[PDB]
Swiss-Prot record, chain A:
Component of the 40S subunit of the ribosome. It comes from the Eukaryota. It comes from Kluyveromyces lactis (strain ATCC 8585 / CBS 2359 / DSM 70799 / NBRC 1267 / NRRL Y-1140 / WM37). The chain holds residues 82 to 150 of 150 of the full protein. A zinc finger (C4-type) spans 40-61. This is Small ribosomal subunit protein eS31. Part of the 40S ribosomal subunit.
Curated annotation (Swiss-Prot), chain D:
Keywords: Ribonucleoprotein, Ribosomal protein. One of its GO terms (biological process) is cytoplasmic translation. The gene is RPS29. PANTHER family: 40S RIBOSOMAL PROTEIN S29 (PTHR12010:SF2). InterPro entries: Ribosomal_uS14, RIbosomal_uS14_euk_arc, Ribosomal_uS14_sf. Belongs to the universal ribosomal protein uS14 family. Gene3D superfamilies: 30s Ribosomal Protein S14, Chain N. One of its GO terms (cellular component) is cytosolic small ribosomal subunit. It comes from the Eukaryota. This is Small ribosomal subunit protein uS14.
Length: 69, 96, 122, 53, 106
């Protein structure tokens, strides 16, 4: 065979930067709950939005929002 | 191998009804016959099985053939649940 | 000692894990508790910052309360099943079971229903 | 899982595989065999094809 | 009571000749016992299938060739006979290899 090329730069799959208890939602009293951000309009509650500078997208429906909140 | 675990459970379930599996040697295929998953993922699953005991494998004419052994039937019961007196193809359903 | 020491709740989690009807994790419990799926709720005691404990309290009290104490999470994960093979017996690598919510049930009657009745009716 | 993992291979050499080996070289498609002539040449007597004249 | 003649054509197509000719003889002998008006065992042209192929794998050495071919023997036995007598002649007179088949619709 002929020799291989070798530019240099290699790109690996990102490790993701995992995190737990992360870090939305709150409770002031104890019993009741006080949701932060919002839940999904399309799917049922339990799934939450993603808050950026006037841009949102969900996870269960890959990336399907548009309107602000 | 990096399988969304729901799709894997469907393949196991579909394996246990039949007791048999006729997969192609066709990667890049969008969806498998009968099962609603990619063919490649079924072959990865039946590759993963063959190694840790089970599952008698052939590769003739671009068609893999996988039958479940006695220990293969035991582990598929462990993954799903179904206790005893069940389908596979170890014995007949009624009269056929 | 013939009487069970809260061992009719772990038996539900085994049968739920066996029949494929567990909503283990933080978010799956919330989705289970919202619509008609999650019937029995399981929240961890030892929780840092009190966050995940307070969440399930609210999800329980949102419509129908299905909650109970739970024995330090790690014991439920070992009791249910979190580890492939693990030698001949025991020797499972320890896992925190997190928040869990029961779907399906499957098995009927026995001590599990007796513990659910006493905690609910007061 | 990645999006672009497929050129449009409806036709030509790259689409037409054989039933047996998976080859794109000397492929009998006549009478819809879909067999590389060398495997055909092996099994021809099995598939009903005999040398008469 | 019925005696409703649908006009049924029988298709006999196969590789082997000595079976096919014996099968074709068996149906007409059944027609002679059941005594029906029928056109005899019609014999259509034999579609010979010619796969031309070089003998080699490598394409090296001399350029030799093998006409791997298949004989086919397409025959017909047209019946001017009812539906029920055809149901009888389908049940009996079945040999291995030869492709027995019924058109049934004139
Ligand atoms: Mg290179
Ligand atoms: Zn969405």
């Amino acid at each position: 065979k002929k020799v291989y090329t070798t530019p240099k730069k290699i790109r690996h799959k990102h490790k993701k930067v995992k995190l737990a208890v992360l870090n939305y939602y709150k409770v002031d009293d104890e019993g009741k709950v006080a949701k932060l951000r919002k839940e999904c309009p399309n799917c049922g509650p339990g799934i939450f939005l993603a808050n950026h500078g006037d841009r949102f997208y969900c996870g269960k429906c890959h990336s399907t929002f548009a309107t602000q909140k | 191998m990096l399988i969304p675990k729901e799709d894997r459970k469907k393949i196991y379930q579909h394996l246990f009804q039949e007791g048999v599996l006729v997969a192609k040697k066709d990667f890049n295929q969008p969806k498998h016959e009968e099962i609603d998953t990619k063919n490649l993922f079924v072959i990865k699953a039946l590759q993963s099985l063959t190694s840790k005991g089970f599952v008698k494998t052939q590769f003739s004419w671009q068609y893999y053939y996988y039958t479940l052994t006695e220990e293969g039937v035991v582990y598929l019961r462990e993954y799903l649940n179904l206790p005893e007196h069940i389908f596979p193809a170890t014995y007949l359903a009624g009269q056929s | 000692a013939e009487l069970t020491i809260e061992d009719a709740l772990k038996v539900v989690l085994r049968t739920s894990l066996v029949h494929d009807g567990l909503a283990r994790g933080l978010r799956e419990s919330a989705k289970a508790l919202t619509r008609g799926e999650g019937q029995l709720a399981v929240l961890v005691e030892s929780v840092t910052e009190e966050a995940i404990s307070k969440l399930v309290q609210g999800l329980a009290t949102e419509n129908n309360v299905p909650l109970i104490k739970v024995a330090d999470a790690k014991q439920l994960g070992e009791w249910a099943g979190l580890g492939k093979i693990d030698r001949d017996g025991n020797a499972r690598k320890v896992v925190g079971a997190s928040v869990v919510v029961v779907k399906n049930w499957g098995a009927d009657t026995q001590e599990r229903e007796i513990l659910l009745e006493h905690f609910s009716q007061q | 899982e990645n999006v672009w993992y497929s050129h449009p291979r409806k036709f030509g050499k790259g689409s037409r595989q054989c039933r047996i080996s998976g080859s794109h070289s000397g492929l009998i498609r006549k009478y819809g065999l879909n067999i590389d002539r060398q495997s055909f040449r092996e099994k021809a007597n099995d598939i009903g094809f005999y040398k008469y004249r | 009571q019925e005696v409703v003649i649908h006009k049924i054509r029988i298709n006999l197509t196969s590789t082997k000749v000595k079976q096919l000719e014996n099968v074709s003889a068996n149906i007409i002998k059944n027609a002679e016992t059941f005594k029906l008006v029928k056109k005899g065992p019609v014999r259509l042209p034999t579609k010979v299938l010619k796969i031309s192929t070089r003998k080699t794998p490598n394409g090296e050495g001399s350029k030799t060739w093998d006409t791997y071919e298949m004989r086919i023997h397409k025959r017909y036995i047209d019946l001017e006979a009812p539906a029920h007598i055809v149901k009888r002649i389908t049940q009996i007179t079945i040999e291995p290899g030869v492709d027995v088949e019924v058109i049934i619709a004139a």
